[PDB]
Every structure is written in C-alpha cells, then in structure tokens.
C-alpha cells in the first residue's frame, strides 16, 4: 500500500488510531515477546560466563521491560494498519457497485457437475 496518509510522513499513529481498542492485557503475542525477553536475558547471562539464571536479575527485568514496551507499541501500530486496510477496502467496495456483481448463486438442483467415477 502507498499512502493514503502520505501527508503526515511519520505520524506514528493519528487520532484515527484512537478509535480502535489497544492491545489488551495478557494477549498471547505480548506474552510471547516477554518470554523472548527472558530468553534474551538467559543468553546474555550465558555469553559473559557469569552463571546462567543467576546474578543478573536486574538485567533480566530490564530486558523484559524493554521488549514488552517495544512489542506493545508495535502491536498498536499493527492493529491500526490492518484496520485502515480493512476500512479502505470497504470504502472501495461501497464506492463502485457495478464492478462487483452479486453472483446469482444457483442451488445444487440445477448446477451440473462433471463426475468421472473413480474405481
């Protein structure tokens, strides 16, 4: 997609984003990001030859805080982008009627099918 809010160039979220709900508490994707943050802390304890799962707990909580925060803002922008994609799609649906005809859904009483019986 090309903007379609190619007016404000790096408006990270307009007031258009303040009408859809934000990502809620204990959504599974932010919990996945938090587990990835704990894994980042585990491997940061692993590389520096300090004991893994020990003596770096402030760094553990730092990494978890940072990744949960960044993933929260990414989820917000993500949901705004899919919402504006959906709304522009439906605006183009409602705009032009005649290019999108209602296909006359014939029931199976008259819809013929080639069969080719398999043995």
């Amino acid at each position: 997609m090309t903007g379609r809010q190619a007016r404000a160039p790096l408006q990270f979220l307009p007031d258009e984003a303040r009408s859809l709900p934000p990502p809620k508490l204990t959504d599974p994707r932010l919990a996945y990001i938090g587990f990835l943050g704990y894994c980042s802390g585990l491997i940061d304890n692993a590389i520096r030859r300090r004991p893994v799962l020990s003596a770096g707990l402030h760094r553990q909580f730092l990494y978890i805080t940072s990744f949960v925060f960044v993933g929260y803002y990414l989820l917000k922008r993500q949901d705004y982008m899919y919402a504006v994609r959906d709304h522009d799609m439906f605006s183009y649906i409602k705009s032009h009627p005649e290019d999108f005809p209602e296909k006359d859904k014939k029931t199976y009483r008259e819809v013929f099918e080639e069969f080719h019986p398999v043995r």
Partner: protein
C-alpha cells in the same frame, strides 16, 4: 456413561463449535478473495487510494507578475 460424563465434550458442544468455526472461516475466505479482487482492479484503474505514487506537490507553484509577459 461415567467416562462420557466426566471427560468428554457433548456432541451438541462439538457440533456447534464446528458450525461457528466454519462461519468464521467462511468470512475469512470471502474477505481474502474480496481483497485480491480489490487489489487487482485498483492496479487496473488507478482510481483507488492505494497505488497512488506521489506526484508533484503543487503548493509551491506561484503566479506573480514576471519580468517578461511571454512566459
């Protein structure tokens, strides 16, 4: 009877789960075909908002009395 009571989902429960999940997936598939239709027709016409690469911003064109009338 006890095994079916304490462990197993009801056939009404499982059956209405199937019907609800087929309704959800039907909406998903119809919207996905609608999306590809919208994208192909919008690249065809160019009327829609998406495939509009930036042309000239005309805010800076001025007309003000020049140094030669044959502009």
């Amino acid at each position: 009877r006890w095994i079916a009571r304490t462990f197993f989902d009801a056939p009404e429960k499982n059956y209405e789960r199937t019907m609800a999940i087929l309704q959800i997936e039907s909406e998903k598939a119809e919207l996905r075909l609608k999306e590809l239709e919208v994208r192909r027709l919008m690249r065809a016409k160019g009327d829609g908002p998406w495939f509009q690469y930036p042309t000239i911003d005309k805010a800076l064109i001025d007309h003000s009395p020049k140094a030669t009338p044959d502009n």
